Amino acid sequence: MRGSHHHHHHGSGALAALHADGPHAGLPVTRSDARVLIFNDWEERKRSEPWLRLDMSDKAIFRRYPHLR
Secondary structure (H helix, E strand, C coil): CCCCCCCCCCCCCCCCCECCCHHHCCCECCHHHHHHHHHHHHHHHHHHCCCCCCCCCHHHHHHHCHHHC
8 A cells, every 4th residue: 555646638529339249358459448448437437426526547558558559
């Protein structure tokens, strides 16, 4: 338990493309698919829970989802 970060600095309401089969089935295909997945999932969870914090820099996408690189 060390450190903290906040970057509610981005947002894009769209559809995300996912892999259908093999190693990555159900994962986003591009960095922008991963951003759009985080954003749409946050919009739904934020409509359920109004406090929800959003963090989706290029670094945060490659750290949460290492398969995009």
